[PDB]
Structure formats: structure tokens, C-alpha cells
Amino acid sequence: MDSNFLKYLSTAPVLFTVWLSFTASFIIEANRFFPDMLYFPM
Amino acid sequence: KKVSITVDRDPVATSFEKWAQPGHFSRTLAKGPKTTTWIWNLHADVHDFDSHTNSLEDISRKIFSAHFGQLSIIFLWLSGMYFHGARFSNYSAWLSNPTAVKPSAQVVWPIVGQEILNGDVGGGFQGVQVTSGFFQIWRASGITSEVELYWCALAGLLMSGLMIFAGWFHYHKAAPKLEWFQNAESMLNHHLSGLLGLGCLSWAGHQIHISLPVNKLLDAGVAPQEIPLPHEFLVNRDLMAQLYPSFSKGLVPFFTLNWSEYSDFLTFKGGLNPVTGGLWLSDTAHHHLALAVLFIVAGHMYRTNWGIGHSMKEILEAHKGPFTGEGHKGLYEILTTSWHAQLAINLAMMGSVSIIVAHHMYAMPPYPYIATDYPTQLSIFTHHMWIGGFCVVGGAAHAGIFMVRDYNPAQNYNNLLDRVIRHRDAIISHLNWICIFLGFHSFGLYIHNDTMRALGRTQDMFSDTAIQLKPVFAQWVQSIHTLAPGNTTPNALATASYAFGGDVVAVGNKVAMMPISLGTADFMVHHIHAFTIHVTVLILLKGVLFSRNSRLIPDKANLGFRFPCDGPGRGGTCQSSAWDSVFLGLFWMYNCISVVIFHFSWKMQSDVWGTVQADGTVTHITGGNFAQSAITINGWLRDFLWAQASQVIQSYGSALSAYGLIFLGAHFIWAFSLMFLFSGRGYWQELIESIVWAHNKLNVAPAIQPRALSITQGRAVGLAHYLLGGIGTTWAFFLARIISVG
Amino acid sequence: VPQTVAWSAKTGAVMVLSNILCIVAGRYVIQVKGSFAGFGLPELLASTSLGHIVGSGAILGLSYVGVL
Amino acid sequence: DFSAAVPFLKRPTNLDGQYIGDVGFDPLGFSDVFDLRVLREAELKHGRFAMLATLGFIVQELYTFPFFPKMAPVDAHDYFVKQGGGSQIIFWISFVELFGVVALFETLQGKREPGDFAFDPLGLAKDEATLERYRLAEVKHARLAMIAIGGFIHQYWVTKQTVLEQLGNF
Amino acid sequence: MPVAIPPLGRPETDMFDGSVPGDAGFDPLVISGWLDSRWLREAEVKHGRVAMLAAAGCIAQDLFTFPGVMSALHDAAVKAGSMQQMLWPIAILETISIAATIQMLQGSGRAPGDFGFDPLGLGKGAKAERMALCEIKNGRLAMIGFSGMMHHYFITGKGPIELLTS
Ligand code: CLA
Ligand code: CLA
Ligand code: CLA
Ligand code: CLA
Ligand code: CLA
Numbered sequence A: 001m002d003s004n005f006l007k008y009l010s011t012a013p014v015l016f017t018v019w020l021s022f023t024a025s026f027i028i029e030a031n032r033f034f035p036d037m038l039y040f041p042m
Numbered sequence B: 001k002k003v004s005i006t007v008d009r010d011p012v013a014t015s016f017e018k019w020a021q022p023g024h025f026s027r028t029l030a031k032g033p034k035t036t037t038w039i040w041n042l043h044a045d046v047h048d049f050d051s052h053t054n055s056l057e058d059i060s061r062k063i064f065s066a067h068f069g070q071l072s073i074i075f076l077w078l079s080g081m082y083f084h085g086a087r088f089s090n091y092s093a094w095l096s097n098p099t100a101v102k103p104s105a106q107v108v109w110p111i112v113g114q115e116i117l118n119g120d121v122g123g124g125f126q127g128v129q130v131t132s133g134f135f136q137i138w139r140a141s142g143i144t145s146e147v148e149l150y151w152c153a154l155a156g157l158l159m160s161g162l163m164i165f166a167g168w169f170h171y172h173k174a175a176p177k178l179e180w181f182q183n184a185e186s187m188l189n190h191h192l193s194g195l196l197g198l199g200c201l202s203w204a205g206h207q208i209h210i211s212l213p214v215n216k217l218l219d220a221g222v223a224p225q226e227i228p229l230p231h232e233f234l235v236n237r238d239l240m241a242q243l244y245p246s247f248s249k250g251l252v253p254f255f256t257l258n259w260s261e262y263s264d265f266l267t268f269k270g271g272l273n274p275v276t277g278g279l280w281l282s283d284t285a286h287h288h289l290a291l292a293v294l295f296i297v298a299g300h301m302y303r304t305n306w307g308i309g310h311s312m313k314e315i316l317e318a319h320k321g322p323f324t325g326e327g328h329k330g331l332y333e334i335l336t337t338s339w340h341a342q343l344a345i346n347l348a349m350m351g352s353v354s355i356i357v358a359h360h361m362y363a364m365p366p367y368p369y370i371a372t373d374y375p376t377q378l379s380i381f382t383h384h385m386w387i388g389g390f391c392v393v394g395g396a397a398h399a400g401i402f403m404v405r406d407y408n409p410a411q412n413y414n415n416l417l418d419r420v421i422r423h424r425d426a427i428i429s430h431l432n433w434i435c436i437f438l439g440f441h442s443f444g445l446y447i448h449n450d451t452m453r454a455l456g457r458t459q460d461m462f463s464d465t466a467i468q469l470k471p472v473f474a475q476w477v478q479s480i481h482t483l484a485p486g487n488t489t490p491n492a493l494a495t496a497s498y499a500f501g502g503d504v505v506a507v508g509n510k511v512a513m514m515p516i517s518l519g520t521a522d523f524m525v526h527h528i529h530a531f532t533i534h535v536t537v538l539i540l541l542k543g544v545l546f547s548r549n550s551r552l553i554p555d556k557a558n559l560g561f562r563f564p565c566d567g568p569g570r571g572g573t574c575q576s577s578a579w580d581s582v583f584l585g586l587f588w589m590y591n592c593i594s595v596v597i598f599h600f601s602w603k604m605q606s607d608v609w610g611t612v613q614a615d616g617t618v619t620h621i622t623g624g625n626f627a628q629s630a631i632t633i634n635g636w637l638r639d640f641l642w643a644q645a646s647q648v649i650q651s652y653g654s655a656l657s658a659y660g661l662i663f664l665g666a667h668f669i670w671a672f673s674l675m676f677l678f679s680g681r682g683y684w685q686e687l688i689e690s691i692v693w694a695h696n697k698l699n700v701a702p703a704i705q706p707r708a709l710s711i712t713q714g715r716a717v718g719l720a721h722y723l724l725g726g727i728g729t730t731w732a733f734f735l736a737r738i739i740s741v742g
Numbered sequence C: 001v002p003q004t005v006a007w008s009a010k011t012g013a014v015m016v017l018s019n020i021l022c023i024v025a026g027r028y029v030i031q032v033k034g035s036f037a038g039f040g041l042p043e044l045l046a047s048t049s050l051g052h053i054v055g056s057g058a059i060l061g062l063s064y065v066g067v068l
Numbered sequence D: 001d002f003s004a005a006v007p008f009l010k011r012p013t014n015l016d017g018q019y020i021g022d023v024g025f026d027p028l029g030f031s032d033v034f035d036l037r038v039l040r041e042a043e044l045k046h047g048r049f050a051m052l053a054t055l056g057f058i059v060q061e062l063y064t065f066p067f068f069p070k071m072a073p074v075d076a077h078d079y080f081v082k083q084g085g086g087s088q089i090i091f092w093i094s095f096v097e098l099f100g101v102v103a104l105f106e107t108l109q110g111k112r113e114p115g116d117f118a119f120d121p122l123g124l125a126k127d128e129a130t131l132e133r134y135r136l137a138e139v140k141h142a143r144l145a146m147i148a149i150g151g152f153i154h155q156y157w158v159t160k161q162t163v164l165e166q167l168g169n170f
Numbered sequence E: 001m002p003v004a005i006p007p008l009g010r011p012e013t014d015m016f017d018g019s020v021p022g023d024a025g026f027d028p029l030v031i032s033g034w035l036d037s038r039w040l041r042e043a044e045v046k047h048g049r050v051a052m053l054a055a056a057g058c059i060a061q062d063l064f065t066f067p068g069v070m071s072a073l074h075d076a077a078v079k080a081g082s083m084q085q086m087l088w089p090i091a092i093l094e095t096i097s098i099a100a101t102i103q104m105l106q107g108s109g110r111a112p113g114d115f116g117f118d119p120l121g122l123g124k125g126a127k128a129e130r131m132a133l134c135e136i137k138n139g140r141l142a143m144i145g146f147s148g149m150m151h152h153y154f155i156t157g158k159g160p161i162e163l164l165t166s
């Protein structure tokens, strides 16, 4: 891995997009496998 | 020779170092951020190449490679459209039953209940209905299978890769010199004869050799799976000659000028194909072949290495008269040194061409089964109208940028530009007066008619059942064009379009095209259009002509193209730049195109689009309400805005509910835009001071000091969210209405 | 449809006449290049291309109007 | 001056003979724009894939494991898509290819040869000259097998026969 | 210095210096003065070699046919797929010739029409110039003969040697 390419990958827009997509993928897979969670189940 | 190839080899090393240094292109920005303003400046001025360096050669190389990058993106988009047509569409079922299968080339995943958007579009398929018109284009091109669409997608991907490789090579490995870019005559010759001419010739070849037999078999009722492959149409001359017998005579009639033998597959029939509702493909094949001949002839005009050809500098300098001083002298240097002037001209022409495309494509449907696809027609008209308006305003903007930056008064003494500058006051005063006259005698007619209908005086209104404003000139032009076949166009079987007059072309009990009558309401709305276009011209031209100086600010050119103000002095000099004139002209372009598309939607839904039933009567979508309702603002408010929004607000729980969501969301964002538009920087900066105090109390203040957005950025953000909100609202309303009722 | 004719000696005569007129006209009017000195291959190609263009236009017009 | 293989073409400037098997054959100028280390890694990977593919086409029709049904290798691709063995092979090839990515990154820094994976457990190359010879043999067999695998698969596609039955008749 | 036609003289170009084999001083349109010399020389030699192979093929096919069964032969071999099977190696060899011609136009040491091919060794030394002369003249004669005999086929549907003996 070229260090300049890694430093470019460490910039705010790239990391922002990657982190928000990663978070969205967590929410999407959680709602795919555990849908319709209006509430915390008792 | 004078026109030659000069290239510098390896001018910029291919490296990732500057990828890690944001703002490397600007000496101001390369020092690094200190405020949040830096970030916005970094993303706002990045492709403004002329402000980073004074060398025209590097700017031209950057422009050439950025154009290659855009071409790569466009090819990737086209390849995506072909692939999504190939794999996620109902295209074969649409090919079997065009009049009953809604085109759909987008399928959603089921995640949170959004699978409800995969509506029942027919043909045993569920997906999002598409209105881009790709199905009709592929039917016109002779694409009968999804394998051909897969191959088209692969070709698009290969061309995208070729374009991005060409960009990398032609910037980073072999960059052309400034002398290579400054050949206008060679560029026009090659782009007229090779790009437009050979392109038209090869597409006429494809239309004649592939599109005509496949579409003739399709219109005769043959299923697509039994239609022969295109290469079989190429090699089996008998198979073609059953459909077009002139192919039995070969290329001998072409070279011996016995061209009428080819009259069966090169026609000038006009009108529309009764089976499909589109233009005859033979007419289009002769049309593109004639365009190829004309473009290749036009591509030999300009002087080159050999002695033949015209010199554009001599042509420009020869055209001068007693009213205009030196005439067109000095414009060749302007257009061969300033990229911004060329961008102004080309954006203006592309916008006007897009508007012409929208008008001429609704009125003369060129594709099979696109006329009765009312959502596709409305979508492509509205889309190309908006693109045209945006490109025209961009041409004005970049004209103003040329005027501020690249204009030199020493090289522009007593030419047309200097004399235009020298009577700018007369121009703007007369245009302002005619704009006020147009506003009064167009909008006050609507206000007057609203008051008269509200006062219970129907006989005092401007209407066809009251005091009339008859559009006699346009009706006379329509009568001439209806009478044109056989009188002034003796070789035409039918009119160029039935919108001027004639029969009702209907396909599958739906009106493909019918005559579009013009009355008092059409008079008033066309003069409203003229009023809005003249006011937009007033704003943009006043911004361009007063970009360098005025009676208010004598040194406006020193401040630049884009500055917020010159202070509160002289009474206040707010929004004095040409950029702010573009900022207001974008609003007025939005108003103009909005009124144009509202007129279009209502007039087609009320007088053109509809269902044909027994005894030949045409039942329109809104039942012919345009003549009596489009003469008042109340009629527009109730019978067009209130009436046709029922479909987007009752779309919840159906496949069109996303449009309703987008409707609300656009309603949100547009209103959010006014928060930027109505407010000012100092309030937000002091509120940011308080928030900075709050972050300082918890020792969580950022090193990059937060600042409010600039005054110019406040205007730009408000304008961008305003345009997005308005265009999205019209988008959702139009699409939901026309998918539901058409 | 306008009537066109098969190739004949009249068609050849009009085309040859159009080529010879366009060669003389190109000899006389081209500004940047005994009487035929400086006559080069690009000028001959341009003049004969205009000759084919003018001959095609004249042949189609005379075939329309009946002179054939 | 000129290329050793094609006498009427000039020798490509980046083909100076540092890579074994160089005969100056690059008429399109691929080595003039792209890194030759990447090209040699791609050449050797494609060639080793093709060698294993050709040997599989011979052996896998000569012999078949008892715990699998018998079919042709082209139909075996489509069968093992659905049974799941092909997914296993793709997964393990990807797992090795991650360290192939790391090896290519080491190659791009010049710290690793474009074909050295340091895999010689049977010690077949003792000294230098045999290793140079085995590089020339490997490159030639790589190119030959790259042609031969396309021959095998396209000939199956046209004749619907495997190699050894096409050898017996026509 | 052979002057083909005396009234027009010998064109003053890069060609007709005398180093080019086969020059007779014949270029009345002065096409050499507007297109490159080496491109035209390569085009002439390639056209000539193709026409030699074509005339030899017509003669040999009219004498004898390979066991197992002009323009109709082109059509029937397209129907057989034979013409594609000759299109592929000419296409690859001609892409390699595209490369060679681009390099040669760029200013490499390759002479036009030279492919470096001499397995027999007849060319090496003093023979090559004379052989070049023979080649270019036989090439031009091939382009005349083939163009004759094909229109002969168009009029009679018959092969040229079979026309000659009948
Ligand atoms: C006849 C030769 C020819 C042709 C076809 C073109 C074509 C083009 N030029 Mg151009 N140009 C030429 C000569 C030519 N140029 C010369 C001689 C000069 C120097 C004076 C320039 C200088 C020049 C500049 C400075 C710019 C262009 C740009 C463009 C593009 C305009 C955008 C567009 O409509 O793309 C859509 C049209 C297409 C045809 C898409 C396909 C794109 C590829 C490249 C076409 C390749 C066709 C190929 C030659 C033939 C293969 C077809 C078939 C046989 C397989 C277009 C691809 C602009 C651009 O965007 O540059 C990137 C631009 O800024 N040109
Ligand atoms: C022997 C000489 C000869 C003869 C007898 C003719 C005769 C004819 N030519 Mg012809 N032509 C000739 C030589 C000749 N031409 C030459 C040398 C060329 C150059 C190759 C042409 C190229 C040519 C073309 C390209 C066409 C003709 C056509 C015609 C026919 C048109 C009939 C008519 O009423 O026009 C029509 C009269 C009109 C007024 C129609 C209007 C035409 C356009 C739309 C006007 C556009 C104006 C534009 C907007 C600019 C105006 C603004 C201005 C203020 C700047 C007519 C029989 C036409 C044809 O074949 O029709 C079947 C045709 O399309 N000619
Ligand atoms: C042919 C097209 C074209 C080209 C090549 C240019 C090129 C240029 N323009 Mg120009 N312009 C164009 C069209 C074009 N423009 C049009 C059509 C308009 C009218 C709207 C303008 C209006 C305009 C102004 C007013 C200004 C320029 C400026 C510039 C220069 C710098 C631009 C820059 O750095 O932006 C960098 C890129 C960006 C900032 C990205 C913009 C992103 C937009 C605003 C949002 C897109 C929204 C998206 C489509 C929808 C998302 C919605 C979703 C989230 C739901 C550069 C020379 C500026 C300059 O300095 O000139 C000297 C300047 O002041 N132009
Ligand atoms: C619907 C709201 C509205 C209205 C009515 C106007 C009206 C006007 N604008 Mg404006 N504008 C608006 C919204 C509006 N704008 C918005 C939202 C923007 C946002 C960017 C702009 C941006 C803008 C710019 C940038 C420019 C204008 C210009 C103009 C003038 C054009 C001349 C004209 O049409 O005269 C006709 C007048 C009208 C249509 C107003 C209604 C009058 C009718 C006929 C009824 C009259 C009744 C009578 C007078 C009542 C008498 C009763 C007595 C008791 C007084 C006009 C004063 C331009 C200008 O001034 O140049 C000439 C100009 O350059 N405006
Ligand atoms: C015949 C082709 C061939 C040849 C000549 C070479 C040659 C070489 N390889 Mg190489 N390689 C090949 C194929 C080949 N390889 C294939 C197909 C793969 C993928 C598995 C590899 C993977 C590979 C790696 C990963 C590495 C090498 C390395 C080397 C070098 C070390 C010398 C050595 O041990 O090789 C000598 C090889 C032989 C003498 C081949 C012996 C073959 C015997 C006869 C067994 C045949 C298989 C048998 C028939 C199957 C039994 C099944 C049954 C049903 C019949 C040398 C240049 C190393 C290197 O470059 O570093 C120094 C290294 O790191 N190779």
C-alpha cells in the first residue's frame, strides 16, 4: 500500500462516505434479519 | 505545416502525492485550512482552471482531459442503462405487447417495505416504471433480445474504459501543445465532416440495413423471436429484397444517380406510422443520410495545410458596415484565446437545441409506440426543457465570466463588443421598458379575467365566448403547414406533424397525435412565455454588460466576477456582481420553464391526449377544460394544480407512493432553501459564536474554526436547494399524475 | 416521387461539363494556392469534387423538370 | 536496435531483456504505458491458471473421483456452481489472492520479482542457470497453455466432445 | 534519370532522388508532393504482392484444384466459412503491419516493403536492388493482368487460361 494513497483514503470525505455506508449497512442488515422493531421486546 | 500535431511527453508524473494534499491546485489553498470556509473554497473553485495558473496550454490540457472524464462517465451511464435494461427489465414482454405493458427497468430490493414500489407493470413483471424512453429507442434500433442489450452494455463499458484511458494518456503521458488546441478551422472541418457527417452516415447505414427490415417485420405482426438476426439481413440480399425490392438492384442506382429506384426504403412520407404512432423510419433514414451529406460538404469549408478553404478571420473582418465601425474584427482572437467565450456560445447553442428537441419531439414522435406512452413524452419534454434553460443561463454566466476576466479593451477598440458596451444603457432601458409592457399587457389580462369572473361579469372577460384575442398569425401558419403537402411541398404524402391540422392518429385506442387548436388562452400563455423569456434576457444581459463597471461601481472588474458586494455604501451595493445576476436569472429561468411545462402538461392533457372510442369521438383526460379555465389564475389553481395533484397525494399505499414522499421532501427542501435565501451571514456567525462557546466549555472546540457560509455561498446554497425543491415537486407531481391517468 | 433516369451519354455529358466548368472556376477564384501554373492535386480534387456535386444537382434537377 | 523475434519491428524500449523469455514482442506498446512488473505478474498468473486448466482437462476426463458424478468439465462448472464446490474453490483462490495482492504490492516496490512466490519445496532449481532455464521453460509453457486452454474449451463448444475423443476420430 | 513524359518533366519531391527502386519519373498528378513517400511505396509494394498472389492463384486454380470440393468462389467460400478462416491470419498479420507502418512513419530504420524475410538468402548482397526492380515491375504487371482478367470473368464467366485455350 502506497502511503500517499492511504493518506488520500484517510481524508474526511472518503472516510465519511465509507463510515456512513458502513453504518447504513448495519442498519439495513439489522432491519433485514430483525424487521418491524417498533419496540424493545419484553 | 501550419496545422500539425505538437505534444509534450510525460508533462505530469502519475503519482498519488497530490491526492493526499487537498488544495494543491491553488497557492492560497495549499497552505491548508484554518477555517471551515477553506473547505467550501476548495470544492467551489477546483475546476476553475484559469484562476490557478496563467498558462493557457495547461488550462486547455486540463479542459481536454476533463472532457474525456465526462465522456467516460456518460459512457458508463449508458452502459448501465443497457445492462439494467438487459437484466432487470420487462423488455421482451413490452416488445410482444407495446400497448398494454408499462416499461420498467428498475427493481428494488425488499428491505423496509419499499418492495411495494415494485408495481404491477404488466408482462408478468414487477418493478419501478421508467419514463426515459429507452424501450422505444431499442425498438427503433432493432434490438429484439436482451443478449443484444448485454452486448451494448459491454460496449458501453469498454468505451468508458477507453475514454478514461484516453484522458489519462492525453493529460499525464502525451499532452497536446497550445498550438494544437488553437486550430479552429481544422477542428470545425473534422467535427463537421467526421463527427457529425460520418456519424450521420453510419447511423443512416444502420437504419437502412438493420432498423428498417426489423421494424417492418415488427409492424407486420411478427413475433420478435422469429425475426432474423441483423447479420442475416446483411448477407441475405434476397431476405432484404422481399421487404425492399430495390436492394435487388444493389449499389448501381446510387453511383449512376438513379436514386428514385431507392424510393421504397428512402421516403419522404411524413405524418406518422399508423401501426406505431411514430415517424416513418425510411423518412428518418433519408433525413440522416441527407444530414450526413450536408455535414460532410460543410466540413470542407475551412482553410487547412492545403491552399483550399475559407479563413474565418478574413470572413469576420470582411463583414463590416457603416453602422458598426470595425465590425466583427477581433472576435477570432477572442474565441481562439478565451475558453470562456467558447463555453458561453456552446452552452447557449446546446440549450437552444435542447429546447428545439423538446418541442420537435413532442410534436413529431420519432420512435415506435412513444406517442401513446404519455409519461415518456411528458418526462422527455420537461427534462430537455430544464436542461435547455440551465444551459442557456450557463452560457450567459460564462459570457459574464469572459467579460470580467478575459476581455481586453486594447484589442477591442471600436468593434461590435465595444459599441455594445457603449450603448448598454439604451439596450437595458428599452428591454426593461418592453419587459414592463409585456408584464402589464400579459399578466394583467389574467388578473383582469380573474376579477371579471369574480365580479360576475363573464361578458367582460378575455375569452372565446367574450372579447377575443385571437392568435391569427399562428393559426395562419398552421393553415399554411396543413396546406403544405402537395402545394408547397409536392413530394410529401402527409404533413410534417398533425399538430398543425389533419386527422387524429390513434394507436391502441389512445391518441398518438391530433390537431392542437390555439385560442385566447394559448395567446395569453404564449405572450406570458415571451414576457418571461424577455425578463430573463434582461437580467442576464444586464449582468453581462455591467459586469466590468457601472455608474455605481466604476471598478467592478477589479473586484472580480464573483463578489458579494462593495459594502453598504452608495446606499447599498448588494448583489452587484454578474454572478448575482446569474443567481436571479436562474430563478427566472425556473419560473419560465415551470410555466412552459405547466402549459404543456395542461394543453396535452386537455386537448391532445385521451382515449378514442366508438363513433370516433375523443375523450380527453381532463375533458377539454383548457379553453375556459386557463384564462384565469383561479382556473390554473383549481383545474390544473388542485385537480391533478389528487394522484400524488392519494398515492400512499400504492406503487407511486415514493413520488408522494419525494413530493413532500421537495416541499421540505425548497422551504429549507429560504432559510439561506432570506437570512444573512452576521446572525449565523454570532449564533456560531455561541455554539463555539458551548463547545469551548467542554473543551471540544475544533482546530478548524467554524465560520458561517459566505454571502455568495449563502445565495448559491439557497438557490441550489430552491431549484432542487421546485424541480423535484414538479417532477413528482407530473410523474405521479401522468403514470396514474396515462 | 421525382423521376430519375438510368445512366446514359446525356448524364455523362452533363457531369463532364460540370467538372470542366468547376475546374476553370476553381482556377479563377481560389485566392490561396502559364495559366495552369501552381495547379496542384488538392486544387484538382476540390474542383472535381465540386464538379461531381454540381453535376449531381444538375442531373437531378433536369430529370425532375423533364429535360433529362 | 530491432526486435529479435519480429525483425521489421523496432525493439520496445522497456523490453531490454531483464525478464527471461524477452524477444521484443509488443507491437501495441503495452509496456510503453503500463508497468512491466504488473504485466509479468498478470502473464504468469494467467499462464499458471491455463497450465492447471489444460492438465485438468486431460486428467479430469482420464480419471474422475468416485464421490462425484461423471460429466464434462464445461458442464462441471455449471454443476459445481449449484452443488457448492465451485464456491469453495473460488473462496480459497480469493484467500490466496489476498496475499497475492500483498505480493504484488511488494513487487511494485522492487523488493520482489514479478514471478517469485518463493515456492520450491522439492528444491528442483539448485543453482542459477537451471533456474534461468526453468524460467524460460515456464514462460514458454505458460504462453502455450494459454493458447491451448482456449483451444480445448472452444473445441468443446463447437464439437461437443472432449479432447481425447476428438483425437481418436478427426 | 528516366523521364517518362518529356513535356511535364521530373517531379521535385522526396521521391525520384534515384534511391527508390523502380522509379521511371512518372507522377503527372504529383501525388508524391502531398502524401508521404514511404507510405505510398509501402502501399504500392503491398498492392503488387497481393496482385501477384491473386494472379498466381487464378492461374493455379484454373490448372488444378486441391482434392475435396472467381467471385462466385468468394461467395461460396463465405458460405463455407473458408473466407473467415483466411480473414483471421491476414487480420492479425495486418495489425502487426499497422504497428510496423506506424513505427516506419515515426522514423524507424525499416525500408518500405521490407519485412526482414529472406530464408533462401537470395537477396543478401548485390542482388537485392535488381530483385526490387523485378518485384516492382512484376507487381505493376500483376495489377494490370488481374484487373483485366476479372472484368473478362465479368463478361464471360470463364477463366483466363481457359478462355485462352478455347
Ligand atoms: C474526424 C475526427 C474527429 C472526431 C470524430 C472527433 C470527435 C470528437 N471531438 Mg475532436 N478534434 C479533432 C478531430 C475529431 N474529433 C481534431 C482534428 C482536433 C484538433 C483541431 C480536435 C480537437 C478537439 C477538442 C479540443 C475537443 C474535441 C472533442 C471531441 C468530442 C466531442 C464530444 C462528443 O460529441 O462526443 C460524443 C461523440 C462520439 C463519437 C463518442 C465516441 C468518442 C470516440 C473518441 C469517437 C472515436 C471514433 C473513431 C475515430 C472511429 C471509430 C468508429 C468505428 C469505426 C468503430 C468528440 C468525440 C471535445 C471532447 O470532449 O474531448 C474529449 C473537446 O474538448 N475535439
Ligand atoms: C441544372 C440546374 C438545376 C436545376 C434546374 C435545379 C432545379 C431544382 N433543384 Mg437543384 N441544384 C443544382 C442545380 C439545379 N437545380 C445544383 C448545382 C445543386 C448543388 C448540388 C442543387 C442542389 C439542390 C438540392 C439540395 C435540392 C435541389 C432541389 C431542386 C428543385 C426545387 C424546386 C423548388 O421549388 O425549390 C424549392 C423552393 C423553396 C423556396 C423551398 C425552400 C427551401 C429551404 C427550406 C429554404 C431555406 C431558407 C433558409 C431558412 C435561409 C433563408 C433566410 C435568408 C434571409 C438568409 C428544382 C427542380 C430540391 C429537390 O430536389 O426537391 C425535390 C433540393 O432539395 N437542388
Ligand atoms: C458545459 C458545462 C459547464 C462547464 C464546463 C462549466 C465550467 C465552469 N463554471 Mg459553469 N455553469 C454551467 C455549466 C458549465 N460550467 C451552467 C449550466 C450554469 C448555470 C447553472 C453555470 C453557472 C456558473 C456560475 C454561476 C459559476 C460557474 C463557474 C464555473 C467554473 C468553475 C466551476 C467549479 O469549480 O465548480 C466546481 C464544482 C462544483 C461546485 C459542484 C457543483 C454541485 C452542484 C451545485 C450541485 C448539484 C446537485 C445535483 C445535480 C443534485 C443533487 C440532489 C440530491 C442530493 C437529492 C468553470 C470554468 C464559477 C466560476 O468561478 O467561474 C469562473 C461560477 O462562479 N458557472
Ligand atoms: C408574483 C410575484 C412577483 C411579481 C408580481 C414581480 C413583479 C416584477 N418583477 Mg419580480 N421577482 C419575484 C416575484 C415577483 N416579481 C421573485 C420571487 C424574484 C426572485 C428572484 C424576482 C426577481 C426579479 C428580478 C431579478 C427582476 C424582477 C422584475 C420585475 C418587474 C417586471 C416588470 C413587469 O412585469 O411589470 C408588470 C408588473 C406586474 C406583473 C406586477 C403586477 C401588476 C398587475 C398588472 C396589476 C396592476 C394593478 C394596479 C397597479 C393596482 C393599482 C391600485 C392602486 C391602489 C395602487 C415587476 C415589477 C424585473 C424588473 O424590474 O425589470 C423590469 C427584474 O429585473 N423581479
Ligand atoms: C511445467 C511448467 C512449469 C515450469 C517449468 C515451472 C518453473 C518454475 N516455477 Mg512454477 N508453476 C507452474 C508450472 C511451472 N513452473 C504452475 C502450473 C504453477 C501453479 C501451481 C506454478 C507455481 C509456482 C510458484 C508458486 C513458484 C514457482 C516457481 C518456479 C521456479 C522454480 C523452479 C522449480 O521448482 O520449477 C521446476 C518445476 C518442474 C521441474 C516441474 C515438475 C513437474 C512434475 C513432472 C510433476 C507434474 C505434475 C503431475 C503430472 C501431476 C500428478 C497427477 C497425476 C494424476 C498424474 C521455476 C522457474 C517458484 C519461483 O519462481 O521461485 C524460485 C515459485 O515460487 N512456480
Ligand SMILES: CC1=C(C#C\C(C)=C/C=C\C(C)=C\C=C\C=C(C)\C=C\C=C(/C)C#CC2=C(C)C[C@@H](O)CC2(C)C)C(C)(C)C[C@H](O)C1
Pocket (backbone or CB within 6 Å): E052, E053, E055, E056, E059, E117, E118, E119, E120, E121, E122, E123, E138, E141, E142, E143, E144, E145, E146, E148, E149, E160, E161
Ligand atoms: C522474396 C522471397 C521469397 C519469395 C517469393 C515469392 C512468393 C515469389 C514470387 C511470387 C509471384 C506470385 C510472382 C509473380 C510474378 C509475375 C506474374 C504472376 C506475372 C503475370 C501475372 C499476370 C497478372 C498475368 C497474366 C495473364 C495471363 C496468363 C492470362 C490472362 O489474364 C492475360 C495475361 C497476359 C494478363 C521466398 C519465400 C522464396 C524466400 C526468399 O528468401 C525471399
Ligand SMILES: CC1=C(C#C/C(C)=C/C=C/C(C)=C/C=C/C=C(C)/C=C/C=C(C)/C=C/C2=C(C)CCCC2(C)C)C(C)(C)C[C@H](O)C1
Pocket (backbone or CB within 6 Å): D073, D074, D077, D078, D146, D147, D149, D150, D151, D153, E092
Ligand atoms: C464462458 C464460460 C466458460 C468459459 C471459459 C473460458 C475458460 C474461456 C477461455 C478462453 C480462452 C482462454 C481463449 C483463448 C483464445 C486464444 C487465442 C484466440 C489465441 C490466439 C493466438 C494467436 C493468434 C497467435 C498468434 C501468433 C502465432 C501464431 C505465433 C507467433 C506469435 C503470434 C503472432 C502471437 C466455462 C467453461 C467456465 C463455462 C461457463 O458456463 C461459460
Ligand SMILES: CC1=C(C/C=C(\C)CCC[C@H](C)CCC[C@H](C)CCCC(C)C)C(=O)c2ccccc2C1=O
Pocket (backbone or CB within 6 Å): B675, B676, B677, B679, B680, B681, B684, B707, B708, B709, B710, B711, B713, B714, B715
Ligand atoms: C443556516 C445558514 C448558515 C449556516 C450553515 C452552516 C455554517 C454550514 C452547515 C454545513 C454542515 C456542517 C455540513 C452538512 C450538515 C450535515 C447534515 C451534518 C454535518 C456532518 C458533520 C460531521 C460535518 C449560513 O452560514 C448562512 C450564510 C449566509 C446566508 C444564510 C445562511 C444560513 O441560512
